Amino acid sequence: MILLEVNNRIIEETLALKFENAAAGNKPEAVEVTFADFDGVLYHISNPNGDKTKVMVSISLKFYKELQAHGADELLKRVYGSYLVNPESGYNVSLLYDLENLPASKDSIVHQAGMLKRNCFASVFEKYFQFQEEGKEGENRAVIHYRDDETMYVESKKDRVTVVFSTVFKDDDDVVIGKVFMQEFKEGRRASHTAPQVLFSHREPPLELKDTDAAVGDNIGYITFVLFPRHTNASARDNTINLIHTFRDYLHYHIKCSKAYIHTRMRAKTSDFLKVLNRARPDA
Amino acid sequence: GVVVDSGDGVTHICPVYEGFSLPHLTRRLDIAGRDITRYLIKLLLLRGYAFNHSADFETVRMIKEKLCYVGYNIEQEQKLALETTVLVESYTLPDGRIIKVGGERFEAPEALFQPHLINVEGVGVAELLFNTIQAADIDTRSEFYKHIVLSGGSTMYPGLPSRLERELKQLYLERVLKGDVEKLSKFKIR
Amino acid sequence: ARFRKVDVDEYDENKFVDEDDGAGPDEGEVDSCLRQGNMTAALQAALKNPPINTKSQAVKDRAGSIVLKVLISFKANDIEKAVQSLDKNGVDLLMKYIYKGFESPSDNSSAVLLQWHEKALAAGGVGSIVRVLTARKTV
Amino acid sequence: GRLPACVVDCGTGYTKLGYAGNTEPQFIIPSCIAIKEVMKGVDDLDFFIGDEAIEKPTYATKWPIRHGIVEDWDLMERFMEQVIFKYLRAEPEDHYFLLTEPPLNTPENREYTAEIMFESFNVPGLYIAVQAVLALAASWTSRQVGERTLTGTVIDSGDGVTHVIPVAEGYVIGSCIKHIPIAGRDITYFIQQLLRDREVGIPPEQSLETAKAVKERYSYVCPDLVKEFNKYDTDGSKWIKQYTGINAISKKEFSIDVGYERFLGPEIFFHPEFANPDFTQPISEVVDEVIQNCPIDVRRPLYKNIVLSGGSTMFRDFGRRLQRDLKRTVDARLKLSEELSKPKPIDVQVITHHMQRYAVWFGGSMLASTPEFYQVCHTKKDYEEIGPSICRHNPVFGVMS
Amino acid sequence: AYHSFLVEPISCHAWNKDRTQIAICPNNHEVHIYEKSGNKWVQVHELKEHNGQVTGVDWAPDSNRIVTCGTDRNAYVWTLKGRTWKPTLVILRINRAARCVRWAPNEKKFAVGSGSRVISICYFEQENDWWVCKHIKKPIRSTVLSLDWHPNSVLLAAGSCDFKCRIFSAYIKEVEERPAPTPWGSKMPFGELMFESSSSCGWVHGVCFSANGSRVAWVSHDSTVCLADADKKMAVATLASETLPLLAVTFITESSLVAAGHDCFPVLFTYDSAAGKLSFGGRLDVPTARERFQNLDKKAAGLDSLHKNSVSQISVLSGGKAKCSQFCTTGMDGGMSIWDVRSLESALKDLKIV
Amino acid sequence: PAYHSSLMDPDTKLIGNMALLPIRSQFKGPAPRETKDTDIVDEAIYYFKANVFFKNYEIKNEADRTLIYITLYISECLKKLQKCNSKSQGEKEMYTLGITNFPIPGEPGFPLNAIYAKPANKQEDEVMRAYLQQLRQETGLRLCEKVFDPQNDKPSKWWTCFVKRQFMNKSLSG
Amino acid sequence: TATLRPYLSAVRATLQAALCLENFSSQVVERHNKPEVEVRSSKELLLQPVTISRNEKEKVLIEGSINSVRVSIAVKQADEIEKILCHKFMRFMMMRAENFFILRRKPVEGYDISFLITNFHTEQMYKHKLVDFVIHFMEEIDKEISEMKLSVNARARIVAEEFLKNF
């Protein structure tokens, strides 16, 4: 697995199972599941008021207010319609599935439910992609604190939309590894000439953010994606959002997988050294 | 002269003048072999070997007798344990499993000199030995110091005699002198 | 503990004490030879009267400089001949200075010093290195 | 914090994974990994785990854990990659992890595990729990108990071998453990033979299929063989069942009768000689032998708190039969005594409860949901300042306060 | 002629008077005794008393007594009663490991070099029926590694980790009597320092007195061999080697020495009295009809020496130090070699010897 | 574990070290006449389905030796009853089987020669030979009413399934 | 290179000189046996430490004694990624010091990796093969660090390409 998946397997498997038993005519079993996603996301799947014929899926994002300022409530309603209800205390968005009133295609709602986190983030991109398409320049940039100490900046310009990530490498050595990955991204147009352009600044924001309170430090790295109309149009939009919202986690995932691979190299070389060493003995 | 006897149950420092013992000037130490085996169990636990205090007491006792020793300079011993593997010895358990024992070899017996390590009040076999000789008769101090003798199963740890000697030098230098007047500070533990 | 902080061993009468007592080669002489392109001659002069007995590292560090100055000034192909002009004692002393040099690398100084090591080893064998190791009085 | 810890219980046959506080695991997947077989580029990432790994054409299925211990560290590490990033979808730097180990796992293996978790996944905190100890904690859910205790005898029976493990004060008495070569697979095979000799129309290449199903759907433990045989031979209409499966080849239906195998399968725990020529000790005798090998002082508490773990201990009346049979051996022993010479009668209790199948994971989940867990975990800061040696010892907790 | 007794070190050895039995310490707390049966070696005795590694063994020829010393600080004198060797404890009065031991030629005393920076001179008193020892202390400042007795049984050579080879008097009037003067000096009171080498480099691993005692030789860790000539006012000839340190040395004539050590093979050295000079003349380990046949090459570790690890002891087997005909080496490879001086002279036309 | 007989009596007689237990039977032989409603043969037949799986068996009584013989014999009957088509026919094969001379303790071909006492004299021989035959005869006919279902030609699979199993891993045909 | 061979040749000869050890019972502590180069309680038992350097960065420190030799190596580290790769690899080996029994658990200050070789090793292993091993090790850690570097770079290109091509 190179690319990270977008959908949540716990949500889909949980709902699929409830939906198949409901359709089969079985009595419903109680469900109570608390689990996470990347970026400090917390989910809760439960039976509201103990009614086992109702299944609620809730998401909590510390930065939801920020997404709401950029259309989240509207998009979520467009996607989930009547499944969307008043949010459970402790959470920002809640979906309610009535087992006695399921649609003909149960698989399709399982899929959208699995993409709840992605769908929360979608509005901010769609908003700035729209700005670009309409030629509305000068609009204030979106500022999304997706992690306690990380920030995503979205700005629409005449011919492009920029997405800037301010990420933190807690492990000093991960910065060094991360720089190897970022240099390849910087040179990426050498393999896909139409792909977004990527920039990288270590320990300092891009100049446009120098006058704000953007973080500065030895373990901070800034990454800029430059998205063009071919990436931001109505036809490419969904796929583009699916990718860009996973980028930060994609990078950190690959740094960790690289370290694991290097461990395999170390096991092999050390094992070989020990065999040589033992061959220096006359024997037992 | 003074005899240091450490067995499995208790320790005793017994001075003797031209014939017999003198209860006044006789002190007992609240730490002995069993206490060292117990501390070893605790040390091994910290190393990841959870031996049961009852079921495996004899096994850990056997590990102690075979591998334990008394450190001369704990600072140096700790450096050896932390920075090298020269102290690491393999020991085969009765069920065939082989474990690896290192720094715990000198740590366990150190309780004899640092009773607080096992939550016991006191000053340690050596400081104790010193206080017995220092307070006694003035006309036997010299004779006493040069006639200390070890006895018992818990006194056979490699290095024990050398450690005792070193600890008395440090005590005599500090609590009987101040500057360097050692040379003549003669005393042998044979 | 306190009483354990003192290293009583430093006052042990039964320890071991080295036999110590209380200038180097002629700087001007080495310079003369070098200035005249007489390298072998400079080598032999730099190896004279080594401060094997002084306490201060300043005088020792001085002779090592002079000796090192000479080794660096040498042409690669002319090393073997100079080394072969020395007696066994000279070869042993040279090896001591070479190891000395390994501790102050700068530019390609170690690069030529490895050449010297090779030639000196060819002349004095591993025994000359052994004698760097157990010297109590050294450069 | 707002986010629950990750709980992963890696077994020889299956790995149970999820988030602390939950009653059941979010995933139960076979502990296998399918790879392609000088790695270059991203070849190391081309793999699948669990069910997605059992049947993949261009890939070879590997089992990194043999006898509960890791035998391939490269593969165990890769396996963990997907556990975290594909199934849990946890940012590992944001979650403390609870992992498990069999008793007798070495401290070295503990360091290898910590090396992967801290140095590859950058976890903030780690605890390694002993399986049997978690199984004990899991039993605190039982109605039969009133005080929390980590002294007991754990019977762990999954698919491979059955273990009898005495624990005192939260630490397994390693020198007293005994193993039994009877587990789920053995039960299946015996049932297979029984069907082979009696029923017809069973596709050979589907012989196991039927046997396992018969076992999972119709097997149980009976209190007396002859009485049971007599039952079936009299009221057969309400004791004999029928099973019907489909021929993978031809798509037609075969119907078979299910009888004696229902009670004969699980019986081999108590009469191993029925199926195993090399082992004959009944499980009740193994347990007695273990407890009598433990310190006298702890043999009464051990007899009073015998706990079960694993799917093979789930047969109806398994615990009742164990408790009965063990009570008989022990009562019989104390009979001889009196006669020869009034030893207080020994209380034998086999605990069964609802969370047995994944008792280990459940105990893990309950414990990792408490503040105490966070106190006892080893932090990344300590791992860095002190070293992997700190992971050699993982203090027990959950009982006293 | 190599034989492998084991694959770990032989720590020390000694032969009986007739050279029919060899005692060895196989890197152990034990001493094992071997004897030939035809052309095979067979173990005949196991001496087990020490609670530490045995680091020295010597065998008194005529009285047929074995003495052993070990890291347990003890020494034992072993006496053969019937078919079994029985030990008697000898108290050295030391608090560190014993390192080396040698019976004097008169078999009335033995000397043990120790980590107590002292030499224990032991003798039996047929008055109290036990062994006693006197220490030679001043001015030894480090572990004593090697010993060799002068033929007069009084003078004793010692090599130590303080870089010195020394000669002391071990004169014990109660077992021997006023020794005749020697070029080493007229005054030989107990513990008298007769001679002390003048180098402050290299542990002195081995020492040996010539057959007549007027010469003493020693090898040090600084890859030198030295010889002090009492007939030349104790003048010292030195020879610096191009190879690794020697651990063991013995005279084979008044003017010839054989030594071995970390190179793993025996070498020859000669002394020119006139010039007072030591010369290297060696390397004695060079790779009839039976011989011709046996030596013929075949149709086709990685050392070119018989021993495969350092040689730590050499002993003269036949001919004495005056005209040695055969000598023995043991080493850290667990091997034992017997070398024949005449064979060596034959195979090496350029061989000197004197 | 395995089922043992509870029919040994302080006045039970012995033929060798086998228990000369009474049976209810019209067949000739030295078996005492049984008055109770059950006897050793019913017991063996009752315990068979369980006992036959056992590999080890502790001889507690001389009754067990008799119980064991009958258990092994039931196996011999099932071997023959396996291949037959009718309750009537099965009864005939069982008569034949009962009459055939099976080995007795002391002979090679009889398993358990280490646990069964051989006949000491010719009388003892002939009398043990008669008992054994009278046990076989009654066992066999009694087994027929069990093996066949009121549906003729039905050597019940619930009895047939044991044809390959060997009590204690032994055989009378071995 | 051109200074690789000359460097290893000089290191090798020095190791041959230093690896001349014997069993030495402690002179300081009764019934103890300790590596003299580590404890250093008897100055006369210590040899002169010597350094061999290839340049300002790469060098080997060799410290001898009567019963033990300590060997420390400063490894070539051209850039940041080589620095981290080296640090991780040495740490990885050091964690496993019990199995890799001639390795110190921590390096001498100023070096990347250190060996402690005692008379017990030279008794049970051919000393000349121990020498060969150190040289082999110096050569192979360099090659492995280079291969590791190529690996990370190679995987990084595919990772950037896989993400970017999907837009």
Swiss-Prot record, chain A:
Pfam families reported in the protein's UniProt record: P34-Arc
Record InterPro entries: ARPC2, ARPC2/4
Residues recorded as bearing N6-acetyllysine in the entry: 275
Single GO MF annotation: actin filament binding
Keyword field: Acetylation, Actin-binding, Cell projection, Cytoplasm, Cytoskeleton, Nucleus, Synapse, Synaptosome
Compartment(s): Cytoplasm, Cytoskeleton; Cell projection; Synapse, Synaptosome; Nucleus
Transmembrane segments: none
Gene Ontology BP term (one): actin filament polymerization
Coiled coil (residue ranges): none
Gene Ontology cellular component terms for the protein in this record: Arp2/3 protein complex; cytosol; endosome; focal adhesion; glutamatergic synapse; lamellipodium; muscle cell projection membrane; neuron projection
Superkingdom in the source lineage: Eukaryota
Family designation: Belongs to the ARPC2 family.
Role description: Actin-binding component of the Arp2/3 complex, a multiprotein complex that mediates actin polymerization upon stimulation by nucleation-promoting factor (NPF). The Arp2/3 complex mediates the formation of branched actin networks in the cytoplasm, providing the force for cell motility. Seems to contact the mother actin filament. In addition to its role in the cytoplasmic cytoskeleton, the Arp2/3 complex also promotes actin polymerization in the nucleus, thereby regulating gene transcription and repair of damaged DNA.
Protein name (record): Actin-related protein 2/3 complex subunit 2
Organism: Bos taurus (Bovine)
Swiss-Prot record, chain E:
Single GO biological process annotation from the record: Arp2/3 complex-mediated actin nucleation
GO molecular function list: actin filament binding
Intervals holding WD repeats: 5-44, 49-88, 93-134, 139-178, 241-279, 306-349
Subcellular location: Cytoplasm, Cytoskeleton; Nucleus
InterPro entries given in the database record: ARPC1 (IPR017383), WD40/YVTN_repeat-like_dom_sf (IPR015943), WD40_repeat_dom_sf (IPR036322), WD40_rpt (IPR001680)
Keyword tags: Actin-binding, Cytoplasm, Cytoskeleton, Nucleus, Repeat, WD repeat
Subunit-level organization: Component of the Arp2/3 complex composed of ACTR2/ARP2, ACTR3/ARP3, ARPC1B/p41-ARC, ARPC2/p34-ARC, ARPC3/p21-ARC, ARPC4/p20-ARC and ARPC5/p16-ARC.
Job description of the protein: Component of the Arp2/3 complex, a multiprotein complex that mediates actin polymerization upon stimulation by nucleation-promoting factor (NPF). The Arp2/3 complex mediates the formation of branched actin networks in the cytoplasm, providing the force for cell motility. In addition to its role in the cytoplasmic cytoskeleton, the Arp2/3 complex also promotes actin polymerization in the nucleus, thereby regulating gene transcription and repair of damaged DNA.
Protein name: Actin-related protein 2/3 complex subunit 1B
Organism (species): Bos taurus (Bovine)
Swiss-Prot record, chain F:
InterPro entries: ARPC3, ARPC3_sf
Pfam families: P21-Arc (PF04062)
Primary subcellular site in the record, as a coarse category: cytoplasm
Residue list for modification Phosphotyrosine: 46
Protein localization: Cytoplasm, Cytoskeleton; Cell projection; Nucleus
Family statement: Belongs to the ARPC3 family.
Function summary: Component of the Arp2/3 complex, a multiprotein complex that mediates actin polymerization upon stimulation by nucleation-promoting factor (NPF). The Arp2/3 complex mediates the formation of branched actin networks in the cytoplasm, providing the force for cell motility. In addition to its role in the cytoplasmic cytoskeleton, the Arp2/3 complex also promotes actin polymerization in the nucleus, thereby regulating gene transcription and repair of damaged DNA.
UniProt keyword list: Acetylation, Actin-binding, Cell projection, Cytoplasm, Cytoskeleton, Isopeptide bond, Nucleus, Phosphoprotein, Ubl conjugation
Name the record gives this protein: Actin-related protein 2/3 complex subunit 3
GO biological process: Arp2/3 complex-mediated actin nucleation; regulation of actin filament polymerization
GO cellular component, one term: cytoplasm
Gene Ontology MF terms: actin binding
Chain positions of cross-link Glycyl lysine isopeptide (Lys-Gly) (interchain with G-Cter in SUMO2): 13
Gene that this sequence comes from: ARPC3
N6-acetyllysine sites (modified residues): 55, 60
Subunit structure: Component of the Arp2/3 complex composed of ACTR2/ARP2, ACTR3/ARP3, ARPC1B/p41-ARC, ARPC2/p34-ARC, ARPC3/p21-ARC, ARPC4/p20-ARC and ARPC5/p16-ARC.
Top-rank taxon, per record: Eukaryota
Ribonucleoprotein found in the keyword field: no
Curated annotation (Swiss-Prot), chain G:
CC per GO annotation: Arp2/3 protein complex; cell projection; cytosol; nucleus; site of double-strand break
Annotated organism of origin: Bos taurus (Bovine)
Quaternary structure and partners: Component of the Arp2/3 complex composed of ACTR2/ARP2, ACTR3/ARP3, ARPC1B/p41-ARC, ARPC2/p34-ARC, ARPC3/p21-ARC, ARPC4/p20-ARC and ARPC5/p16-ARC.
InterPro entries for this protein: ARPC2/4, ARPC4
Gene Ontology molecular function: any one: actin filament binding
UniProt record, GO biological process: actin filament polymerization; Arp2/3 complex-mediated actin nucleation
Residues annotated with N-acetylthreonine modification: 1
Keyword Repeat on entry: no
Pfam family, any one: ARPC4
PANTHER family (UniProt xref): ACTIN-RELATED PROTEIN 2_3 COMPLEX SUBUNIT 4 (PTHR22629:SF0), ARP2/3 COMPLEX 20 KD SUBUNIT (PTHR22629)
Keywords: Acetylation, Actin-binding, Cell projection, Cytoplasm, Cytoskeleton, Nucleus
Protein's recorded name: Actin-related protein 2/3 complex subunit 4
Cellular location(s): Cytoplasm, Cytoskeleton; Cell projection; Nucleus
Reported function: Actin-binding component of the Arp2/3 complex, a multiprotein complex that mediates actin polymerization upon stimulation by nucleation-promoting factor (NPF). The Arp2/3 complex mediates the formation of branched actin networks in the cytoplasm, providing the force for cell motility. In addition to its role in the cytoplasmic cytoskeleton, the Arp2/3 complex also promotes actin polymerization in the nucleus, thereby regulating gene transcription and repair of damaged DNA.
Leader sequence segment: none
Family: Belongs to the ARPC4 family.
